[PDB]
CSV table of C-alpha atoms and ligand atoms in Angstrom, one decimal:
chain,number,residue,atom,x,y,z
A,10,UNK,CA,109.9,91.9,80.2
A,11,UNK,CA,108.4,95.0,81.7
A,12,UNK,CA,108.0,95.5,85.4
A,13,UNK,CA,105.3,97.7,87.0
A,14,UNK,CA,106.0,98.9,90.5
A,15,UNK,CA,103.7,100.8,92.9
A,16,UNK,CA,105.3,102.8,95.8
A,17,UNK,CA,104.1,105.1,98.5
A,18,UNK,CA,105.6,108.4,99.5
A,19,UNK,CA,105.7,110.4,96.2
A,20,UNK,CA,108.8,112.4,95.5
A,21,UNK,CA,109.3,115.9,94.0
A,22,UNK,CA,113.0,116.0,93.0
A,23,UNK,CA,114.5,112.6,92.2
A,24,UNK,CA,118.1,113.7,92.5
A,25,UNK,CA,119.8,110.9,94.5
A,26,UNK,CA,120.7,113.4,97.2
A,27,UNK,CA,116.9,114.2,97.6
A,28,UNK,CA,115.6,110.6,98.0
A,29,UNK,CA,116.6,107.0,98.1
A,30,UNK,CA,114.2,106.1,95.3
A,31,UNK,CA,116.9,106.0,92.6
A,32,UNK,CA,118.8,103.4,94.7
A,33,UNK,CA,115.6,101.5,95.4
A,34,UNK,CA,114.6,101.3,91.8
A,35,UNK,CA,118.0,100.4,90.4
A,36,UNK,CA,119.0,103.7,88.8
A,37,UNK,CA,121.8,104.6,91.1
A,38,UNK,CA,124.4,103.1,93.4
A,39,UNK,CA,126.6,104.3,96.3
A,40,UNK,CA,130.3,103.6,96.8
A,41,UNK,CA,129.5,101.0,99.5
A,42,UNK,CA,126.3,99.0,100.2
A,43,UNK,CA,124.9,96.7,102.9
A,44,UNK,CA,124.4,93.1,102.0
A,45,UNK,CA,121.5,90.8,102.7
A,46,UNK,CA,122.6,90.5,106.3
A,47,UNK,CA,123.0,94.2,106.7
A,48,UNK,CA,126.8,94.4,106.8
A,49,UNK,CA,128.8,97.1,104.9
A,50,UNK,CA,130.5,95.9,101.6
A,51,UNK,CA,132.4,97.6,98.9
A,52,UNK,CA,130.2,98.2,95.9
A,53,UNK,CA,131.7,100.5,93.3
A,54,UNK,CA,135.0,100.3,95.3
A,55,UNK,CA,137.7,97.9,94.4
A,56,UNK,CA,139.9,98.5,97.5
A,57,UNK,CA,140.2,101.0,100.2
A,58,UNK,CA,142.6,101.7,103.1
A,59,UNK,CA,142.7,104.0,106.1
A,60,UNK,CA,146.4,104.8,106.7
A,61,UNK,CA,145.4,107.1,109.6
A,62,UNK,CA,142.2,108.3,111.2
A,63,UNK,CA,141.9,111.4,108.9
A,64,UNK,CA,142.5,109.6,105.7
A,65,UNK,CA,140.5,107.4,103.5
A,66,UNK,CA,142.1,106.0,100.3
A,67,UNK,CA,139.8,104.5,97.7
A,68,UNK,CA,140.5,102.8,94.5
A,69,UNK,CA,137.5,102.4,92.2
A,70,UNK,CA,136.7,99.4,90.1
A,71,UNK,CA,137.9,99.9,86.6
A,72,UNK,CA,135.0,98.3,84.6
A,73,UNK,CA,132.2,100.6,85.4
A,74,UNK,CA,130.3,103.0,83.2
A,75,UNK,CA,127.5,105.5,83.8
A,76,UNK,CA,124.3,104.9,81.9
A,77,UNK,CA,125.3,107.5,79.2
A,78,UNK,CA,128.5,105.5,78.5
A,79,UNK,CA,130.8,107.8,80.5
A,80,UNK,CA,133.5,106.0,82.5
A,81,UNK,CA,133.2,106.0,86.4
A,82,UNK,CA,136.4,107.7,87.4
A,83,UNK,CA,137.7,109.1,90.7
A,84,UNK,CA,137.1,112.6,89.3
A,85,UNK,CA,133.4,111.7,88.6
A,86,UNK,CA,133.1,110.4,92.2
A,87,UNK,CA,134.7,113.5,93.6
A,88,UNK,CA,132.4,115.8,91.7
A,89,UNK,CA,129.3,113.7,92.7
A,90,UNK,CA,130.1,113.7,96.4
A,91,UNK,CA,131.0,117.3,96.4
A,92,UNK,CA,127.7,118.3,94.6
A,93,UNK,CA,125.7,116.2,96.9
A,94,UNK,CA,127.3,117.8,100.0
A,95,UNK,CA,126.7,121.3,98.5
A,96,UNK,CA,123.0,120.5,97.6
A,97,UNK,CA,121.9,118.4,100.7
A,98,UNK,CA,122.1,119.1,104.4
A,99,UNK,CA,121.5,115.4,105.0
A,100,UNK,CA,124.6,114.5,103.0
A,101,UNK,CA,126.6,117.4,104.3
A,102,UNK,CA,126.0,116.4,107.8
A,103,UNK,CA,126.6,112.7,107.4
A,104,UNK,CA,130.0,113.4,105.5
A,105,UNK,CA,132.3,115.7,107.4
A,106,UNK,CA,134.8,115.7,104.6
A,107,UNK,CA,137.4,118.4,104.5
A,108,UNK,CA,138.9,117.6,101.2
A,109,UNK,CA,138.9,115.2,98.3
A,110,UNK,CA,141.7,114.6,95.7
A,111,UNK,CA,141.4,112.4,92.6
A,112,UNK,CA,143.5,110.8,89.9
A,113,UNK,CA,142.5,108.0,87.6
A,114,UNK,CA,140.6,105.5,89.6
A,115,UNK,CA,142.0,106.6,93.0
A,116,UNK,CA,140.6,109.1,95.4
A,117,UNK,CA,141.6,110.3,98.8
A,118,UNK,CA,139.0,111.6,101.3
A,119,UNK,CA,140.2,113.6,104.2
A,120,UNK,CA,138.6,114.7,107.4
A,121,UNK,CA,139.7,117.1,110.1
A,122,UNK,CA,139.4,114.6,112.8
A,123,UNK,CA,138.5,110.9,113.4
A,124,UNK,CA,135.0,110.1,112.0
A,125,UNK,CA,134.7,106.3,112.2
A,126,UNK,CA,131.2,106.3,110.6
A,127,UNK,CA,132.4,107.9,107.4
A,128,UNK,CA,132.7,104.6,105.4
A,129,UNK,CA,129.3,103.5,106.6
A,130,UNK,CA,127.7,106.7,105.5
A,131,UNK,CA,129.3,106.4,102.0
A,132,UNK,CA,126.8,103.4,101.7
A,133,UNK,CA,123.9,105.8,102.4
A,134,UNK,CA,121.6,105.9,99.3
A,135,UNK,CA,121.5,109.8,99.5
A,136,UNK,CA,125.2,109.5,98.7
A,137,UNK,CA,124.6,107.6,95.4
A,138,UNK,CA,127.1,108.4,92.5
A,139,UNK,CA,125.6,110.3,89.5
A,140,UNK,CA,127.3,112.1,86.5
A,141,UNK,CA,127.6,115.7,87.4
A,142,UNK,CA,128.5,116.6,83.8
A,143,UNK,CA,125.3,114.9,82.3
A,144,UNK,CA,123.4,117.4,80.2
A,145,UNK,CA,120.1,116.7,81.8
A,146,UNK,CA,118.3,117.9,85.0
A,147,UNK,CA,119.6,115.7,87.9
A,148,UNK,CA,116.3,116.4,89.6
A,149,UNK,CA,114.4,114.7,86.8
A,150,UNK,CA,116.7,112.2,85.1
A,151,UNK,CA,119.9,111.7,87.1
A,152,UNK,CA,122.5,109.5,85.2
A,153,UNK,CA,123.7,106.7,87.5
A,154,UNK,CA,125.6,103.5,87.3
A,155,UNK,CA,122.7,101.3,88.2
A,156,UNK,CA,121.1,98.6,85.9
A,157,UNK,CA,118.0,100.8,84.9
A,158,UNK,CA,118.3,104.3,83.6
A,159,UNK,CA,115.6,106.9,84.3
A,160,UNK,CA,114.3,107.8,81.0
A,161,UNK,CA,111.3,109.9,81.9
A,162,UNK,CA,109.9,111.5,85.0
A,163,UNK,CA,106.4,112.9,85.6
A,164,UNK,CA,106.9,114.7,88.9
A,165,UNK,CA,105.2,113.1,91.9
A,166,UNK,CA,103.6,110.6,89.6
A,167,UNK,CA,105.6,108.2,87.5
A,168,UNK,CA,109.1,107.2,86.7
A,169,UNK,CA,110.0,105.3,83.4
A,170,UNK,CA,113.3,103.3,83.2
A,171,UNK,CA,115.1,101.3,80.6
A,172,UNK,CA,117.6,98.5,80.8
A,173,UNK,CA,121.2,99.7,80.8
A,174,UNK,CA,122.8,97.0,78.8
A,175,UNK,CA,126.4,97.6,79.8
A,176,UNK,CA,125.6,97.6,83.5
A,177,UNK,CA,128.8,96.5,85.2
A,178,UNK,CA,127.7,93.6,87.3
A,179,UNK,CA,125.7,91.8,84.7
A,180,UNK,CA,123.2,92.3,81.9
A,181,UNK,CA,119.9,93.4,83.6
A,182,UNK,CA,117.0,91.0,83.3
A,183,UNK,CA,114.2,93.4,82.5
A,184,UNK,CA,113.6,95.5,79.5
A,185,UNK,CA,111.6,98.4,81.2
A,186,UNK,CA,110.5,99.4,84.6
A,187,UNK,CA,107.6,101.7,85.3
A,188,UNK,CA,107.2,103.2,88.9
A,189,UNK,CA,104.1,104.8,89.9
A,190,UNK,CA,103.3,106.5,93.2
A,191,UNK,CA,100.2,105.4,95.2
A,192,UNK,CA,99.8,106.5,98.8
A,193,UNK,CA,96.8,104.3,99.7
A,194,UNK,CA,97.9,100.8,100.6
A,195,UNK,CA,94.6,99.3,99.8
A,196,UNK,CA,94.8,100.8,96.3
A,197,UNK,CA,98.3,99.4,95.9
A,198,UNK,CA,96.9,96.0,96.7
A,199,UNK,CA,94.0,96.4,94.3
A,200,UNK,CA,96.4,97.4,91.6
A,201,UNK,CA,98.5,94.3,92.3
A,202,UNK,CA,95.3,92.1,92.4
A,203,UNK,CA,94.2,93.5,89.0
A,204,UNK,CA,97.7,93.1,87.5
A,205,UNK,CA,97.8,96.9,86.9
A,206,UNK,CA,101.1,96.6,89.0
A,207,UNK,CA,103.5,93.7,89.6
A,208,UNK,CA,105.3,94.6,92.7
A,209,UNK,CA,104.3,96.8,95.6
A,210,UNK,CA,105.7,97.8,99.0
A,211,UNK,CA,104.2,98.7,102.5
A,212,UNK,CA,101.3,96.2,102.2
A,213,UNK,CA,98.6,96.9,104.8
A,214,UNK,CA,98.7,94.1,107.4
A,215,UNK,CA,95.0,93.4,106.9
A,216,UNK,CA,95.5,92.5,103.2
A,217,UNK,CA,98.3,90.0,103.9
A,218,UNK,CA,95.9,87.1,104.2
A,219,UNK,CA,94.2,88.0,100.9
A,220,UNK,CA,97.5,88.1,99.1
A,221,UNK,CA,98.7,84.7,100.7
A,222,UNK,CA,95.4,83.2,99.6
A,223,UNK,CA,95.9,84.3,96.0
A,224,UNK,CA,98.1,81.7,94.1
A,225,UNK,CA,98.9,84.4,91.5
A,226,UNK,CA,100.6,86.5,94.3
A,227,UNK,CA,103.3,86.2,96.9
A,228,UNK,CA,104.1,88.1,100.2
A,229,UNK,CA,107.4,88.7,101.7
A,230,UNK,CA,107.8,90.1,105.2
A,231,UNK,CA,111.1,91.4,106.9
A,232,UNK,CA,111.5,92.5,110.4
A,233,UNK,CA,114.2,95.1,109.7
A,234,UNK,CA,114.9,98.5,111.2
A,235,UNK,CA,111.9,100.7,110.6
A,236,UNK,CA,110.1,102.2,113.6
A,237,UNK,CA,106.8,103.9,113.7
A,238,UNK,CA,106.3,106.8,116.2
A,239,UNK,CA,104.5,109.8,117.4
A,240,UNK,CA,106.7,112.8,116.6
A,241,UNK,CA,106.4,115.9,118.7
A,242,UNK,CA,106.9,119.6,117.4
A,243,UNK,CA,109.3,120.9,120.0
A,244,UNK,CA,109.0,124.5,118.5
A,245,UNK,CA,105.4,124.7,119.9
A,246,UNK,CA,105.7,125.8,123.5
A,247,UNK,CA,102.5,123.9,124.5
A,248,UNK,CA,104.2,120.6,123.7
A,249,UNK,CA,105.9,120.4,127.1
A,250,UNK,CA,107.5,117.5,128.7
A,251,UNK,CA,104.3,116.8,130.6
A,252,UNK,CA,102.2,116.8,127.3
A,253,UNK,CA,104.8,114.5,125.7
A,254,UNK,CA,104.7,112.1,128.7
A,255,UNK,CA,100.9,112.2,128.8
A,256,UNK,CA,100.6,111.3,125.1
A,257,UNK,CA,103.4,108.6,125.6
A,258,UNK,CA,100.9,107.0,128.2
A,259,UNK,CA,97.8,107.3,126.1
A,260,UNK,CA,99.5,104.9,123.5
A,261,UNK,CA,98.9,101.3,124.1
A,262,UNK,CA,101.9,99.8,122.3
A,263,UNK,CA,101.2,96.1,123.0
A,264,UNK,CA,97.6,96.5,121.7
A,265,UNK,CA,98.8,98.3,118.6
A,266,UNK,CA,101.3,95.6,117.9
A,267,UNK,CA,98.8,92.9,118.5
A,268,UNK,CA,95.7,94.3,116.8
A,269,UNK,CA,96.7,97.1,114.4
A,270,UNK,CA,99.9,95.4,113.2
A,271,UNK,CA,98.3,92.0,113.8
A,272,UNK,CA,101.6,90.7,115.1
A,273,UNK,CA,103.9,92.0,112.3
A,274,UNK,CA,105.4,94.4,114.8
A,275,UNK,CA,106.8,94.6,118.3
A,276,UNK,CA,106.2,97.3,120.8
A,277,UNK,CA,109.0,100.0,120.8
A,278,UNK,CA,110.8,101.7,123.4
A,279,UNK,CA,113.9,103.4,122.0
A,280,UNK,CA,114.3,104.3,118.3
A,281,UNK,CA,116.2,101.0,117.7
A,282,UNK,CA,114.7,97.5,117.3
A,283,UNK,CA,115.2,95.5,120.4
A,284,UNK,CA,116.5,92.6,118.4
A,285,UNK,CA,119.9,94.4,118.3
A,286,UNK,CA,121.9,92.7,121.0
A,287,UNK,CA,123.9,95.6,122.4
A,288,UNK,CA,121.0,98.0,122.7
A,289,UNK,CA,119.8,98.6,126.3
A,290,UNK,CA,116.1,99.6,125.8
A,291,UNK,CA,114.4,102.0,128.2
A,292,UNK,CA,111.4,100.4,130.1
A,293,UNK,CA,108.2,99.8,128.0
A,294,UNK,CA,105.5,102.4,128.7
A,295,UNK,CA,102.1,100.8,129.3
A,296,UNK,CA,99.0,102.7,128.6
A,297,UNK,CA,97.8,104.6,131.6
A,298,UNK,CA,95.0,107.0,131.1
A,299,UNK,CA,94.8,108.1,134.7
A,300,UNK,CA,98.6,108.9,134.7
A,301,UNK,CA,98.1,110.9,131.4
A,302,UNK,CA,95.3,113.0,133.0
A,303,UNK,CA,97.5,113.7,136.1
A,304,UNK,CA,100.4,114.8,133.8
A,305,UNK,CA,98.1,117.1,131.9
A,306,UNK,CA,96.6,118.6,135.1
A,307,UNK,CA,100.1,119.9,135.8
A,308,UNK,CA,99.7,122.1,132.7
A,309,UNK,CA,96.2,123.1,133.8
A,310,UNK,CA,94.3,120.9,131.3
A,311,UNK,CA,90.8,119.6,132.3
A,312,UNK,CA,87.6,118.1,130.9
A,313,UNK,CA,86.3,121.6,130.8
A,314,UNK,CA,89.5,123.1,129.3
A,315,UNK,CA,91.2,120.2,127.3
A,316,UNK,CA,94.4,120.1,125.6
A,317,UNK,CA,93.9,120.6,121.8
A,318,UNK,CA,96.3,118.8,119.6
A,319,UNK,CA,96.7,119.0,115.8
A,320,UNK,CA,97.9,115.5,114.8
A,321,UNK,CA,99.1,115.0,111.2
A,322,UNK,CA,99.1,111.6,109.4
A,323,UNK,CA,99.6,110.1,106.0
A,324,UNK,CA,98.6,107.0,104.1
A,325,UNK,CA,102.0,105.9,102.9
A,326,UNK,CA,102.7,103.6,105.9
A,327,UNK,CA,99.3,102.1,106.1
A,328,UNK,CA,99.1,101.5,109.8
A,329,UNK,CA,99.9,105.1,110.9
A,330,UNK,CA,96.4,106.5,110.4
A,331,UNK,CA,95.0,103.5,112.1
A,332,UNK,CA,97.1,104.3,115.1
A,333,UNK,CA,96.0,108.0,114.9
A,334,UNK,CA,92.2,106.9,115.1
A,335,UNK,CA,92.7,104.9,118.3
A,336,UNK,CA,95.0,107.7,119.7
A,337,UNK,CA,92.3,110.2,119.2
A,338,UNK,CA,89.6,108.1,120.8
A,339,UNK,CA,91.7,107.2,123.8
A,340,UNK,CA,93.1,110.7,124.2
A,341,UNK,CA,89.5,112.1,124.7
A,342,UNK,CA,89.4,110.0,127.9
A,343,UNK,CA,92.5,111.9,129.1
A,344,UNK,CA,91.1,115.4,128.4
A,345,UNK,CA,92.9,115.9,125.0
A,346,UNK,CA,91.0,116.8,121.9
A,347,UNK,CA,93.0,115.5,118.9
A,348,UNK,CA,92.2,116.7,115.4
A,349,UNK,CA,93.6,114.3,112.8
A,350,UNK,CA,94.7,115.9,109.5
A,351,UNK,CA,95.7,113.4,106.8
A,352,UNK,CA,98.0,114.9,104.2
A,353,UNK,CA,99.2,113.7,100.8
A,354,UNK,CA,102.7,115.1,100.9
A,355,UNK,CA,104.0,114.6,104.5
A,356,UNK,CA,107.4,116.2,104.2
A,357,UNK,CA,105.9,119.1,102.3
A,358,UNK,CA,103.4,119.6,105.1
A,359,UNK,CA,105.8,119.3,108.1
A,360,UNK,CA,108.1,121.9,106.8
A,361,UNK,CA,105.7,124.5,108.2
A,362,UNK,CA,106.3,124.1,111.9
A,363,UNK,CA,103.5,126.5,112.6
A,364,UNK,CA,101.0,124.0,111.0
A,365,UNK,CA,101.3,121.0,113.4
A,366,UNK,CA,101.7,119.9,117.0
A,367,UNK,CA,102.5,116.3,116.5
A,368,UNK,CA,102.6,113.9,113.6
A,369,UNK,CA,102.5,110.2,113.0
A,370,UNK,CA,105.9,109.2,111.5
A,371,UNK,CA,108.2,106.4,110.6
A,372,UNK,CA,112.0,106.4,110.7
A,373,UNK,CA,114.6,104.1,109.2
A,374,UNK,CA,116.5,104.3,112.5
A,375,UNK,CA,119.6,102.2,111.8
A,376,UNK,CA,120.1,101.3,108.2
A,377,UNK,CA,123.9,100.7,108.2
A,378,UNK,CA,124.8,99.0,111.5
A,379,UNK,CA,125.3,102.1,113.7
A,380,UNK,CA,123.2,104.4,115.8
A,381,UNK,CA,125.2,107.5,114.9
A,382,UNK,CA,123.4,108.3,111.7
A,383,UNK,CA,120.0,108.5,113.5
A,384,UNK,CA,121.4,110.6,116.5
A,385,UNK,CA,123.1,113.1,114.2
A,386,UNK,CA,120.2,113.5,111.8
A,387,UNK,CA,117.2,113.2,114.2
A,388,UNK,CA,118.4,114.5,117.5
A,389,UNK,CA,120.7,117.4,116.6
A,390,UNK,CA,119.5,120.8,115.7
A,391,UNK,CA,119.1,121.1,111.9
A,392,UNK,CA,119.7,117.4,111.5
A,393,UNK,CA,118.1,116.6,108.2
A,394,UNK,CA,115.4,114.3,109.6
A,395,UNK,CA,114.7,116.2,112.8
A,396,UNK,CA,111.3,117.5,111.6
A,397,UNK,CA,110.1,118.6,115.2
A,398,UNK,CA,113.5,120.3,116.0
A,399,UNK,CA,114.3,118.3,119.2
A,400,UNK,CA,117.6,119.4,120.8
A,401,UNK,CA,119.2,119.1,124.1
A,402,UNK,CA,122.7,120.2,124.7
A,403,UNK,CA,123.4,117.4,127.1
A,404,UNK,CA,122.4,114.9,124.4
A,405,UNK,CA,124.5,116.9,121.8
A,406,UNK,CA,127.5,116.5,123.9
A,407,UNK,CA,127.3,112.7,123.9
A,408,UNK,CA,126.5,112.6,120.2
A,409,UNK,CA,129.6,114.7,119.6
A,410,UNK,CA,131.7,112.4,121.7
A,411,UNK,CA,130.2,109.3,119.9
A,412,UNK,CA,131.2,110.8,116.5
A,413,UNK,CA,135.0,110.6,117.2
A,414,UNK,CA,134.8,107.4,119.2
A,415,UNK,CA,136.6,104.5,117.4
A,416,UNK,CA,136.3,101.6,119.9
A,417,UNK,CA,133.0,99.7,119.0
A,418,UNK,CA,132.1,98.7,122.5
A,419,UNK,CA,132.6,102.2,123.7
A,420,UNK,CA,130.4,103.4,120.9
A,421,UNK,CA,127.7,100.9,122.1
A,422,UNK,CA,128.2,102.3,125.6
A,423,UNK,CA,127.8,106.0,124.7
A,424,UNK,CA,124.9,105.2,122.4
A,425,UNK,CA,123.1,103.5,125.3
A,426,UNK,CA,123.9,106.6,127.4
A,427,UNK,CA,122.3,108.8,124.7
A,428,UNK,CA,119.3,106.4,124.6
A,429,UNK,CA,118.9,106.6,128.4
A,430,UNK,CA,119.3,110.4,128.6
A,431,UNK,CA,117.2,111.3,125.5
A,432,UNK,CA,114.4,109.0,126.6
A,433,UNK,CA,113.8,111.2,129.6
A,434,UNK,CA,112.9,114.0,127.3
A,435,UNK,CA,110.5,111.9,125.2
A,436,UNK,CA,111.8,113.4,122.0
A,437,UNK,CA,109.4,111.2,120.2
A,438,UNK,CA,107.1,108.4,121.4
A,439,UNK,CA,108.4,105.3,119.5
A,440,UNK,CA,105.4,103.0,118.9
A,441,UNK,CA,106.4,99.8,117.1
A,442,UNK,CA,109.3,98.1,115.4
A,443,UNK,CA,107.2,97.0,112.4
A,444,UNK,CA,107.8,94.6,109.5
A,445,UNK,CA,108.3,95.7,105.9
A,446,UNK,CA,105.7,93.7,103.9
A,447,UNK,CA,106.2,93.5,100.1
A,448,UNK,CA,103.9,91.7,97.6
A,449,UNK,CA,104.3,90.7,94.0
A,450,UNK,CA,103.0,88.7,91.1
A,451,UNK,CA,104.4,85.2,91.6
A,452,UNK,CA,106.2,85.6,88.3
A,453,UNK,CA,108.4,88.4,89.6
A,454,UNK,CA,111.7,87.0,91.0
A,455,UNK,CA,114.8,88.2,92.9
A,456,UNK,CA,113.8,91.6,94.2
A,457,UNK,CA,115.2,92.7,97.6
A,458,UNK,CA,113.4,92.7,100.9
A,459,UNK,CA,116.3,93.0,103.3
A,460,UNK,CA,116.5,94.6,106.7
A,461,UNK,CA,117.8,98.1,105.7
A,462,UNK,CA,114.5,98.8,104.0
A,463,UNK,CA,116.0,100.7,101.0
A,464,UNK,CA,116.9,98.2,98.2
A,465,UNK,CA,114.4,96.6,96.0
A,466,UNK,CA,115.5,96.3,92.3
A,467,UNK,CA,118.9,95.1,91.1
A,468,UNK,CA,120.3,93.5,87.9
A,469,UNK,CA,119.0,90.0,88.8
A,470,UNK,CA,115.3,91.2,89.3
A,471,UNK,CA,113.2,89.5,86.7
A,472,UNK,CA,109.9,88.1,85.4
A,473,UNK,CA,109.6,84.4,84.7
B,19,41K,C1,113.5,110.5,107.5
B,19,41K,C2,113.5,109.3,106.5
B,19,41K,C3,113.2,108.0,107.1
B,19,41K,O1,112.1,107.4,106.7
B,19,41K,O2,114.0,107.5,107.9
B,19,41K,N1,112.7,109.7,105.3
B,19,41K,C4,113.2,109.3,104.0
B,19,41K,C5,113.0,107.8,103.6
B,19,41K,O3,112.0,107.2,104.0
B,19,41K,O4,113.9,107.4,102.7
B,19,41K,C6,114.8,109.6,104.1
B,19,41K,S1,115.2,109.2,105.7
B,20,LIG,N1,110.0,109.5,106.9
B,20,LIG,C1,108.6,109.2,106.6
B,20,LIG,C2,108.0,110.2,105.6
B,20,LIG,C3,108.6,110.1,104.2
B,20,LIG,C4,108.2,110.6,103.0
B,20,LIG,N2,109.2,110.2,102.1
B,20,LIG,C5,110.1,109.5,102.7
B,20,LIG,N3,109.9,109.4,104.0
B,20,LIG,C6,108.4,107.8,106.2
B,20,LIG,O1,109.4,107.1,105.8
B,20,LIG,O2,107.3,107.3,106.2
B,21,NA,NA1,111.7,112.4,104.6
B,22,NI,NI1,111.0,108.4,105.5
């Protein structure tokens, strides 16, 4: 039983602290997880307690081994977390840990002050546990506790995994897994249709009908918590508030949702899906080309002297470049000349902030039930996913207050305050809350398509 998977968004390093792919493909696990309904659960943890607000006491399960046969102990968890914190800003900024002590299966994690979201962020896949004493490169073949061990990695191309027979939860159902990267969603579907691959993610919405028609294949949709957007580069002085507001008004969100996503998305306002009951969304921006033209006039742009925008896009999320095309067309009516640059390695490209004005983008904005992760990583300076370097001290203050706020209703309140204040800045233009669409050979069973948009393979995934 060999499973062939095709994924977009090629990786360089596949250290767990560099990408969620090891968790996705069943190689690694974090201390906590979210379940099918998106709620935080103990995973590797047998018990935990929080005797005060600066102390987290954890007891690990006693029956868990890494794929090399080494026991999962508190010392191994300590060294893993500490290495990940040292090696990744994302991890570091999500885990304000002041000290860790360990003995046997118990560890104690301390902070300097109350950080209510610490436990939640220990379910983050970037915090997955690996063996720091493994005598192999963690960037190529990390050793985890998951059901499938990474055996070979051809960088940016292909990952080969094998059944870890002593996997703690159950004997995994597949013999091998082969993961190959393919950025073009139409190619991913062709690969599925030709049986080159068995399981693919991020199915282009215009191929959904074809896959539904095909009795050899099946489609799963899940509304979840991913948001597409137009992301602005705030380090470029020409990307003023008026320019951001103008572009916000050239977007037709209802049209994009109806016709580009073909109803597999809802028009977006804030970063966060409006399905979440406590979120107070800002008002929906409706396309207004005349308004955009007026906003650009404030900056001196005219038909004779238009604004020039370099807009980056990428194929991985198939609808993004379709949005870019209609943005380009409509923007011309508002005296903006957009040049679209499609790139193969989007994060590699955006690292050079001299090379772009704006980019199509996609965020997992609330993977573990709380808005804090997104605010800290996306809206704070040097936040790990803040590719356009948005920062506003007034927003910072509220985020900082949020981070120490224990009462949940008060967190919801401050969060809505952050949404309201930041929305005035147009940090990004959030376009759609769009479904994750996964497709597979009908023989492939028990993979995950759940709202957090991270998990896929577990020990029950199989071929029948
Ligand atoms: C910015 C981020 C995202 O899509 O939310 N990119 C990576 C991902 O898609 O997993 C890590 S988090
Ligand atoms: N954050 C973007 C780009 C990316 C590349 N790899 C992971 N993410 C997305 O999820 O589409
Ligand atoms: Na990224
Ligand atoms: Ni991403």
